[PDB]
Symmetry: D4
Subunit: 158 residues, 8 copies
């Protein structure tokens, strides 16, 4: 059963959010990958978020661009930790996505990652670091992942 939910606003978000899917797949974390649009499918959003904990999700990763309300509205309906990924927008380069995600009021948090693929990748890693706290096997795979990242960095340019 999936323990992380990755959800995004539209098909065009998949270009960014696939980086999150891949990383969870790489660490062997059971997850589901869905499209949920806060503005065009608000009821779908409410249902998804309000039932998330009881279906066994531990962490939700939500990605959106523009006026990105998806992560925030999700956090409004579950006590689960929600991680937000600002998808890069065509005009304002994700600066709108960023400010509409990261600036949540006191009381309803969203842990925000970088604009773009990097944030998608880091949402996945953060969700792993969270799960790692109570799954010792995953904890080990994660330290393997980090150590390899570290050791793989070249010493000079080409």
């Amino acid at each position: 059963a999936p323990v992380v939910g990755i959800i995004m606003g539209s098909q065009s978000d998949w270009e960014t959010m696939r980086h999150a899917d891949a990383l969870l797949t790489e660490l062997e974390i059971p997850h589901e990958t869905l499209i949920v649009d806060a503005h065009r499918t608000p009821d779908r959003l409410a249902d998804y978020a309000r039932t998330a904990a009881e279906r066994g999700l531990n962490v939700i990763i939500a990605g959106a661009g523009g006026a990105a309300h998806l992560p925030g509205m999700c956090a409004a309906w579950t006590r689960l930790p929600v991680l937000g990924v600002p998808v890069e927008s065509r005009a304002l380069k994700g600066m709108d996505s960023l400010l509409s995600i990261v600036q949540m009021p006191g009381g309803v948090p969203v842990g925000t990652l970088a604009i773009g693929a990097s944030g998608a990748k880091n949402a996945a890693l953060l969700a792993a670091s969270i799960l790692a706290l109570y799954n010792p096997a995953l904890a080990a795979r994660l330290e393997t992942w980090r150590a390899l990242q570290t050791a793989s960095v070249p010493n000079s340019p080409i």
Copy 2:
């Protein structure tokens, strides 16, 4: 006397800004209701308000919010009514965050956005009036009188 415009805001601190919308609708004798709806702390309250607005007789919604301002956009998601958005000025980013959170809606779910702060609150009410004025000749007449005074009230030189 049943309301035809709904003014809604995220918090009491938003009222400093949204009171200008309230006052202005009162001046034009437009029946309205004024409520607090917090998109994040009372999300179920938000859904129900927005999905029933039309069957309750509302024609226009004016929504004010700051920061990550999701109140106007989520409202529009649940009503076919025109939703007007007012970016409340925020302390750190001076309402820039409020603005981009309101105005940058996707194709398919509109919010008509006004200026940051009191200026926008006032213009929301004026816009909602221009909208209602399309079917109400009395309000249309009150509105052109109002516009005309504004014009005639502008001085021709400054005071030193």
Copy 3:
């Protein structure tokens, strides 16, 4: 007779404003589509706006980029609701268009939509939501449009 007027500053705005034309065409809203340049044809602008109501227009949609004064100056001359679309600019990505449109003073409103095609599309939808208040047929077509938008969203990426 047209009940919405779509006006833009130049031929290059048509790339963005065509999205507004299409949507009004799709909802079967009688409209006219014109070029009106606030700076190069200021008299044309004044005439257009000052005669708009008496020709039967209910809503005006105005699009411009750069120092975008077209929507604002239009609103200065009619009591009709004016909707503004910030066209994306080459250097500042429509941020200049946006600030010169949305920041109208108290007393003369412009309802502003997103930068770019999305805003053009939403100006059209907003004008429809306005007309829908007193045309029951259009109201029905519009709920059809919204419901289809909602139901069409996929549940997963490809």
Copy 4:
């Protein structure tokens, strides 16, 4: 004594900034008129002022406005005269909106834009003087005297 420069501003609150342009033209003995013109609340007043400026003997227009500052640009649309624009500082966006609304004019209709605030108002007047100085030797001489004092008035070390 007929004016050759027109200073125009959107509101009384703009005068806090535009008074520096007024004072400076007075210092250089340049005949000017100072008026309020609101592009949005008195648009017909704007058209008429701008379209007649030249036949009335004006050579340069200095226009100040804030927010969505459309006053300088719309002016230039209706006169062949050089129009100079001063971005008045706005409360939320600190004049950034004023600036982009003035300076980003299309090819074909220029506005020479100065800095945000008093600095710009002062420079508008100085620029309009440099412009008039091309045909007026007396004013040209007054202007180089003025520049020369400014230079000599700068100290060589700070005060602790």
Copy 5:
């Protein structure tokens, strides 16, 4: 009573903001330690704190910093633990610099970033609680009670 969350900040002046995280963890009865770690003036102190956090029993780190805010990111570089970042508001750039310095981490080393200022400090603590709540039923129950009060505490109309 051994701490499971570490709150760390760059300076005493950051405490004006980070105290909200401290208070909130105290309210939810979450054992934490609160320390000063300056990434630039005490870099060796930073490395050692971060590399030992896990073997000391910490589960979540909350880090606050302003300006060129390198404290949260460098922390994450040295622990496998989830690191949460709070952008402290800066005097000139209003925390915008703090924000971009925290949130724009490369793929491979995450920091979960909250809003600029007190809002973010409060949300960091709430997030760290949601994280601990996944394994602690008592804290999970305290947390949903807390969320529920927040909701019920929102008024239905403003005060004029």
Copy 6:
């Protein structure tokens, strides 16, 4: 003899400043077009500006990008009106060019035009509007130019 000087920082500025050259050529304004780099040739700059009036220049048009100090430093050495054109920069899209040109202190003015080709074109037109004040022939050609601009605007998109 030239009465307007167009000067730019580098060869790459010519892509933008050529629009200024063309317009002066079109209105038949005697002008010179030069490269003057405030940072790499500061002495050339001082000479040019400090001798401008006595060579008969009436207006200087200066274009630069990045930390654009060329217009400002020019204004520091002549009582002639100086017009500044922010050339679009690769990273910050001319926002750096703009702020380093337009924000001159009280006492030394630069009349600033838009970022890019539009500003280059408008610097040329502004210089024309200035010269037009005391050359009646040029004044007439300029009203012809403006009237044609106005009358040429189409009434609809294609």
Copy 7:
């Protein structure tokens, strides 16, 4: 006692910021001179100062300016010496204009730019010290002592 660092600023109002550079050089016993040079009002004064700096024995120049801050860049244009730039905070754009005007120099003429405001003034002096420290063992020793105190002076927990 002949100066090896020159601190120069555009105006007396810049001294509020640049005094921190002055004080800090005094603390490290680095001989310096402190002068006003206005790139726009005293441009000939600027050229001469910069072109003679090296033959007068200066090794590093620290230049402070705000707004359209052209002082550091134009200096570098006329000396082969390392020029360090300090963006003074401006009233409307909060030093953002100062920053982009200083830091965005073309390839070929460098200015090492520090933070906006007092922080940057202080760091300019510290940087110029690190530079002089490469040839002066006494100053190098004074500098590492100074760095070491800074580190040891950082507290381990905040005060509530």
Copy 8:
């Protein structure tokens, strides 16, 4: 033995930092060019910086993009002058790189250069101007370099 160290966060930084390598090569300054990633190899960073002075480095040039912590963390561990180059980022065009580098607190300086290749080139020139203070030969080569830069600027566009 190398007297300047050029270090960068990743292979993709080499596109920008190569401009620094070339210039030091052109002035015949003994230097080393390395990849050092503050986030993925924090220990490598500490070692490098903390041993820099005793290996004979006089100046360090550090380049990074995004949340660019590399120059700052480097400065935290050596009393050597550190020069920082903001590498242009994909979304925010190096504005994030810039603010995370230039805004160092009082007490730990980084001398910051322009966003992109220009800054890389200027970091190299600045390091040269620093070394030039106590190497008379290099001082001469540097004045040659500057004089040639100055004399090479054309007088007109092509």
